[PDB]
Ligand binder design. Structure first.
Ligand SMILES: Nc1ncnc2c1ncn2[C@@H]1O[C@H](COP(=O)(O)OP(=O)(O)OP(=O)(O)O)[C@@H](O)[C@H]1O
Lengths: 107, 107
């Protein structure tokens, strides 16, 4: 899905956006060409080569990283063991924060 | 795995054998990366130099899988002396901050 990918990618230069595509093509291509002792294509039988979203996700996760920086690392590092509900104060605090967010949103 | 970071303080009167016991317990871990810092190898440095050295020592530990580090004679790291009292705040903050930063993921 193109729109989903566009939503996922942010702070991406055009060169990054097209390198992402190149990397996805590269991994799909490698899928059907493999040999270690020698080199050999998949008997040219991979004429139905199709690129799946999984290739794009793997590339976006391991291949192409924006230079402008991101904020996933901080989120994952700060909320480590998640949030559980042991008492009302948690709900009260979350509600109050939401109220203040609404305040600043529409003041 | 819930607690990738663990700390511990050995305490006792002077001339007890703390340093040797720490070294032995560290040795019997069979870990890949082990390091033993100490005031003895930076004597006469200024505060900035000590902070740089502590930075460089800790940075290495972040580039392994599992590691153990030793900090002996803390009272010398920061120049404590009863009269006053007088000491270095910069090194103290370096230590306090560094003792609550978990390493990269899966380490
Ligand atoms: N069971 C033991 N416990 C402690 N030290 C021992 C023991 N057996 C032998 N030793 C010897 O005792 C000495 C330990 O002195 P060490 O300087 O390590 O102690 P410390 O209390 O950490 O000293 P410092 O106050 O100078 O930092 C070493 O010579 C060590 O070989």
């Amino acid at each position: 899905d193109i729109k989903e990918l566009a939503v996922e990618t942010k702070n991406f230069s055009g060169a990054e956006l097209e390198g992402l595509v190149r990397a996805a093509q590269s991994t799909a291509m490698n899928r059907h060409i493999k040999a270690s002792t020698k080199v050999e294509v998949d008997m040219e039988k991979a004429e139905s080569l199709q690129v799946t979203r999984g290739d794009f996700l793997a590339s976006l996760e391991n291949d192409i990283k924006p230079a402008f920086g991101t904020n996933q690392e901080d989120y994952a590092s700060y909320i480590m063991n998640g949030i559980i509900k042991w008492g009302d104060p948690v709900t009260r605090v979350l509600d109050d924060g939401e109220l203040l967010v609404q305040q600043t949103k529409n003041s | 795995d819930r607690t990738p970071l663990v700390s511990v303080l050995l305490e006792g009167p002077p001339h007890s054998g703390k340093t040797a016991l720490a070294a032995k317990i560290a040795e019997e871990s069979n870990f890949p990366f082990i390091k033993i810092c100490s005031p003895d190898k930076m004597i006469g440095f200024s505060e900035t130099a000590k902070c740089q050295a502590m930075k460089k020592i800790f940075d290495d530990a972040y580039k392994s899988q599992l590691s153990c580090v030793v900090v002996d004679d803390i009272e010398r790291l920061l120049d404590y002396v009863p009269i006053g009292p007088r000491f270095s705040n910069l090194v103290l903050q370096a230590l306090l901050v560094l003792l609550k930063k978990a390493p990269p993921q899966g380490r």
